[PDB]
């Protein structure tokens, strides 16, 4: 009857951090994909399943809308088979990805004079995440032989680090809101 919530994800005044990335399951509705593909405000629109113009003529069992904020230098890693801090420890796209990622520069919103320290990426982890694994744990990371004993110090680091978004930043270091639609037949146009 009514459209699937593609205004709740693409127009929220407040996204999440890449380590604690949101995920909204979309089901049993009708999707107007024409609000995305013809918006002329996205820096990235790269699709890995079926064509974006040919999107609202395919029905899917289920849709997920992962949304977070990263640097513009790291949108490179929101893609199957990519590597890096974001891909290894924050958000991993399966190499059989069907769906597509949408990123648009948000320096006007997520950057603050004197830094915006509300967005965090996980910097320290022992192993890479599984595809679509989430990790919101904040235990102290033992970078040495000595046990940490729950005391942040030398060779024992708090695992999350803060993007210091600043409106003076270079375009690679400015904030980029990202939406990652995944498809897997209750939803179509």
């Amino acid at each position: 009857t009514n459209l699937c919530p593609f205004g709740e994800v693409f127009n929220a005044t407040r996204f999440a951090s890449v380590y604690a990335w949101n995920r909204k399951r979309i089901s049993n509705c009708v999707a107007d994909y024409s609000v995305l593909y013809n918006s002329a405000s996205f820096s990235t629109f790269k699709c890995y399943g079926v064509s974006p113009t040919k999107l609202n003529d395919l029905c899917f069992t289920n849709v997920y809308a992962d949304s977070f904020v990263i640097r513009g230098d790291e949108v490179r890693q929101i893609a199957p088979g990519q590597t890096g801090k974001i891909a290894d420890y924050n958000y991993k796209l399966p190499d059989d990805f069907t769906g597509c990622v949408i990123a648009w520069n948000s320096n006007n919103l997520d950057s603050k004079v004197g830094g915006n320290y509300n967005y965090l990426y996980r910097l320290f982890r022992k192993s890479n995440l599984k595809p679509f694994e989430r990790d919101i744990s904040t235990e102290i990371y033992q970078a040495g032989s000595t046990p940490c004993n729950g005391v942040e110090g030398f060779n024992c680091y708090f695992p999350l680090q803060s993007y210091g978004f600043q409106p003076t930043n270079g375009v690679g270091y400015q904030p980029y809101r990202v939406v990652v639609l995944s498809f897997e037949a209750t939803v179509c146009g």
Partner: antibody
Amino acid sequence: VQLLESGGGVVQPGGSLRLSCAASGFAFTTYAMNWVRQAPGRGLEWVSAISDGGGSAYYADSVKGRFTISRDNSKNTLYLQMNSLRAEDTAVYYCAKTRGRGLYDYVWGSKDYWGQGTLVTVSS
Amino acid sequence: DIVMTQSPLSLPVTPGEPASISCRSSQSLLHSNGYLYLDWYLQKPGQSPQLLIYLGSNRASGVPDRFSGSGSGTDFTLKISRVEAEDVGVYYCMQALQTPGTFGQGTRLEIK
């Protein structure tokens, strides 16, 4: 790291005030914040402490119930609401961030950075 | 409450000399996890308190090499290895073990 405090001034015994600590230059969503007051010529005493995202809030017994502590993580602002102020609350109040973020780095524990203090004067 | 008693309350020191401060705790401040949960704060005249030492012996950031802490269980000692003309002010010990955080009375340090 900056901690600039607002509020404070002169109020009436039994009145209510609001103290605001504005944090910048650090996360503040991953740190626990303290309030520590100092009466004129009496030394430091702890008042309250709140956890990373609220929830865990602790108070000194001499302010337990009258004072409520809160933080707004989108505004990066630490609050302290004073209620039913006595004449024994006349002090300079400091917001202070906890030094560490681990488990057993207690929210009431070591305070790394302090503010410059705002005086609260209950008088008439 | 954990009562913390300092000694001495005044400490006239000629600069260039070493100085020591002590803090007695009515509880044992040992092993919430293996450490000694006691901090040392310096408040300079007309400034805000600044952290000196935490967890008994660990120096905070920006703290010079001369500020070393020691002591386990209930007896704790600050040792300024060489007093300079800028260490004057009050020093507070603090237990960081239980949720009512009690300071000391404050060893006021001065110049002879």
